[PDB]
Write a protein that binds this ligand. Structure first.
Ligand SMILES: [Mg+2]
Ligand SMILES: [Mg+2]
Lengths: 200, 264, 126, 230
RNA sequence: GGCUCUGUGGCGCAAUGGAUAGCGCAUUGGACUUCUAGAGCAAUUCAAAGGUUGUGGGUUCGAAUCCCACCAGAGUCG
């Protein structure tokens, strides 16, 4: 019941009451000062997972399936990321887009940690046998850089994995219903200092 | 074929006698802060000369231990072990195995000891210089160079490195290691690293669960996928897994632990 | 404020790149003019590179500076960087300084980061 | 000319005089992978052998500085009966100094104490001792290294910082490394997120990132990449 | 039941040379760099403190060192 505009391939909310609600609802979206830009993940999350947000286009409401189609076309990864954005949101985190570093999401607990996130995630969908194509190729140089920069900022690199069964064909990804049949697997990646780790 | 025919350096009696008077204090490197820009000063030249001269003084020293403390080891080429000839010292609490009533060491253990000067490795009745030991022990048939580097790096700290012998959902790393064990090839666990505090009462017979389990791999090698990591963390069991990375003599360690999100 | 802006006339008249590209360009223009508060900005187009460049001026006499907006989706090969460097050199036309342009990475969250790619060797200033 | 022991693709320098020659004349630092005789159990500072990057070995070989030579086979058994008269004759002389000073000594030499003949190898063809020949990554990294060496720099491994060559304006003993030079082919697509991570790390360490690339005609172009706070 | 090998700073060790205890990690402190207090791995660097040398006995101008006994620990041979 919150009107927005999908103008120029981005969701923007104009109404003052709506943006006040969205900032009071766990700090969703980034402003200017004051229209509120809302990322595709947060927009589709408030359209489907809660239903509070209503996105209109061409003076008519859009079915969530059409929203999924448009967001997938305008952002190929939006499927995978959204699933992760759901998986870290049901558990009370505040996943903000975190490409200030080489990672995707920054997870925060609540209000007292104002943007003081303590985790940085690397989303990549994988298969049932864990032989999926790399959404973002990795190497020990890249992982070392990511770990060092995350330690300098006092965070902990994550490696979230989304597992899709073989029975779930990709063509069904048209709806978030496939989210009901996607497993998850989180892997922290921290350095092991051989000097310090001598018991205690 | 043209041959360079190089030659080494042998110490004289005075040099051998004075080598055992060395103090263990290290020469400090870089002498504090390092200058940002090479402005061609007449003072930076003297600092560079002093630092490099101290480096050459430190690199010109050789190990000289008395014959009493040197265990007369003996490398066996075909067998693959380093069967000693005298009773072993303190290093026998945590290193080497016993077989046929005779003490015997693995290639990497004996090479680390020889580099440390604990033993005196022979070969075909000819004592081996550390260079010959490096050429002879490290190979694909035995411990490789990276594995030995990780081994020595951990041993010099006090570790007891042994040799290893065999709405959405939320899975875990050990969840599935039977259908995944058949698909092998690549990273494999090598070392059962214990901790330094366990040196005091280590039992090489029933040592308990190792502190970690090292996988050694180069820094240019591909990063393992979820399949290889899951297989390795199933083989490792409850014992945490650690990946050791070597880039041209520098060693780093990274651990891929499982995690579960607290319910905020 | 967003839809009704005079610069959007030239933004549409350029007709270079996708609507997302011109939108992130307008977002960077608004970021630089409102918060960063530069003296002047412009929307120059590069049809050959299919890019939008923002030729701004931080101080009233500091001189022309170039900012290139790109989303996180865009792929930058080193050839692309060299081409952008040469285009920036042509725009500034100042052989007294090496090729140099600021790359403005922008996310759908409308969060913006910058990196000053300069040709040659640049010592990290204290 | 100097000699470098190349076994299984590993290039090592045993004699300390060669290490001094490399550091002083040719400015090719290297890293030490052995253990110090002075202090055996530590990691703060190491000793001989010196380990050379394959790019350093190829560069040194090509400029006619060190003669790369493969390690010899174990056929030294026949040359014996000389060390027995060597260790025992010194023992008789050694009791003379120790008695006037108021059980024998043994030297664990780091380098081989005997003159040995070993055949050389050509690095321009791939084999079981120089496998780096023909690898595109080795070709790219050596192409970057040669040009960052001609201009005058000291280069060292930089995997800990995510780069490929820490580059310093002088000797690493007395000058902090300036660049974290990477090595990207002209056509390879650089990941923007990895670039952001590397740039932020460079600013943290205070070491400008370099996107070194060799052009098809043959020339290394460098594109420095700093933070751009506005 | 014998045999062999060990016991030194919180942890791993050196001093075997008979002239009295030092090295690294850990801890504490200083300097520098960076980040939003924290972090620092050739952007890092320096300095300090830290001791029933397992216990008793004996040789000796002196015992951590050499010898014996004991206590504890590890391995091995029944
Ligand atoms: Mg004690
Ligand atoms: Mg102790």
């Amino acid at each position: 019941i919150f009107r927005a505009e999908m103008i120029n391939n981005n969701v923007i909310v104009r109404n003052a009451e709506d943006i006040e609600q969205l900032y009071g609802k766990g700090y969703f979206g980034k402003g200017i000062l004051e229209y509120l830009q809302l990322s595709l993940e947060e927009a589709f999350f408030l359209v489907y997972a809660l239903g509070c947000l209503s996105i209109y286009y061409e003076k008519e409401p859009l079915t969530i399936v059409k929203l999924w189609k448009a967001f997938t076309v305008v952002q190929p990864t939006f499927r995978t990321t959204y699933m992760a954005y759901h998986y870290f949101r049901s558990k009370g985190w505040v996943p903000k887009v975190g490409l200030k570093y080489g990672t995707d999401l920054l997870l925060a607990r609540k209000g007292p940690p104002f943007y003081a996130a303590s985790y940085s995630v690397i989303i990549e969908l994988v298969d049932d046998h864990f032989e999926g194509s790399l959404r973002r190729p990795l190497s020990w140089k890249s992982l070392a850089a990511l770990s060092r920069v995350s330690v300098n900022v006092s965070a902990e690199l994550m490696l979230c994995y989304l597992i899709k069964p073989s029975t779930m064909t990709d063509k069904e990804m048209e709806s978030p219903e496939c989210m009901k049949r996607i497993k998850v697997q989180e892997v922290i990646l921290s350095r092991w200092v051989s000097s310090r780790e001598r018991s205690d | 074929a043209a041959v360079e025919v190089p030659a080494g350096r042998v110490l004289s009696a005075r040099e051998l006698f004075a080598a055992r008077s060395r103090s263990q204090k290290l020469p400090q490197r870089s002498h504090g802060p390092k200058d940002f820009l090479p402005d061609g000063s007449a003072a930076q030249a003297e600092r560079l000369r002093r630092c490099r001269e101290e480096l050459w003084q430190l690199l010109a020293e050789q190990r000289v231990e008395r014959l009493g403390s040197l265990v007369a080891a003996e490398w066996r080429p075909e067998e693959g072990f380093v069967e000693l000839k005298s009773p072993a010292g303190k290093f026998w609490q945590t290193m080497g195995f016993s077989e046929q009533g005779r003490q015997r060491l693995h290639p990497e253990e004996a090479l680390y000891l020889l580099e440390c000067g604990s033993i005196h490795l022979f070969h075909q009745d000819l004592p081996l210089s550390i260079q010959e030991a490096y050429q002879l022990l490290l190979t694909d048939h035995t411990v490789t160079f990276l594995q030995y580097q990780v081994f020595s790096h951990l041993k010099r700290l006090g570790y007891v490195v042994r040799r290893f012998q065999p709405v959405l959902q939320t899975t875990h790393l050990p969840d599935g290691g039977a259908r995944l064990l058949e698909k092998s090839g690549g990273l494999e666990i090598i070392f059962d690293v214990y901790q330094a505090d366990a040196v005091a009462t280590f039992r090489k017979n029933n040592p308990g669960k190792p502190y970690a389990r090292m996988c050694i791999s180069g820094f240019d090698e591909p990063v393992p996928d979820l399949c290889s990591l899951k297989r390795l963390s199933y083989q490792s069991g409850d014992v945490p897994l650690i990946f050791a990375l070597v880039d041209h003599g520098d060693i780093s360690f990274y651990s891929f632990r499982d995690f579960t999100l607290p319910q905020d | 404020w967003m839809g009704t802006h005079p610069k959007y006339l030239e933004m549409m008249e350029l007709d270079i790149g996708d609507a997302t590209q011109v939108y992130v360009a307008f977002l960077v223009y608004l970021d630089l003019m409102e918060s960063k508060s530069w003296h002047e900005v412009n929307c120059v187009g590069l049809p050959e590179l299919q890019l939008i460049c923002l030729v701004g001026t931080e101080i009233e006499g500091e001189g022309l500076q170039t900012v290139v907006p790109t989303p996180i989706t865009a792929s930058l090969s080193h050839n692309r960087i060299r081409e952008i460097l040469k285009a920036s050199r042509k725009l500034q036309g100042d052989p007294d300084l090496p090729m140099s342009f600021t790359l403005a990475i922008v996310e759908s969250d409308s969060t913006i980061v910058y990196y000053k790619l300069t040709d040659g060797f640049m010592l990290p200033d204290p | 000319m100097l000699v470098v022991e190349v076994a299984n693709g590993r290039s090592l320098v045993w004699g300390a005089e060669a290490v001094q020659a490399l550091r002083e004349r040719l400015g090719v630092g290297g890293r030490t992978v052995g253990a110090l005789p002075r202090g055996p159990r530590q990691n703060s500072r190491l000793g001989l052998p010196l380990l050379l990057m394959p790019e350093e070995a190829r560069l040194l070989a090509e400029i006619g500085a060190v003669t790369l030579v493969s390690a010899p086979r174990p056929d030294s058994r026949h040359h014996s009966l000389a060390l027995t008269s060597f260790k025992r004759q010194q023992e008789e002389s050694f009791q003379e100094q120790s008695a006037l000073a108021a059980a024998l000594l043994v030297q664990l030499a780091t380098a081989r104490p005997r003159p040995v003949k070993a055949r050389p190898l050509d690095w321009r063809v791939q084999s079981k001792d120089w496998p780096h020949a023909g690898r595109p990554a080795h070709e790219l990294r050596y192409s970057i290294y040669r040009d960052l060496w001609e201009r005058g720099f000291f280069l060292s491994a930089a995997g800990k910082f995510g780069g490929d060559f820490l580059v310093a304006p002088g000797d690493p003993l007395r000058f902090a490394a300036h660049y974290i030079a990477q090595c990207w082919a002209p056509e390879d697509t650089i990941p923007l997120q990895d670039l952001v991570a590397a740039g932020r790390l460079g600013t943290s360490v205070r070491a400008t990132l370099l996107l070194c690339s060799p052009q098809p005609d043959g020339k290394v172009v460098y594109t420095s990449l700093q933070w751009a706070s506005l």
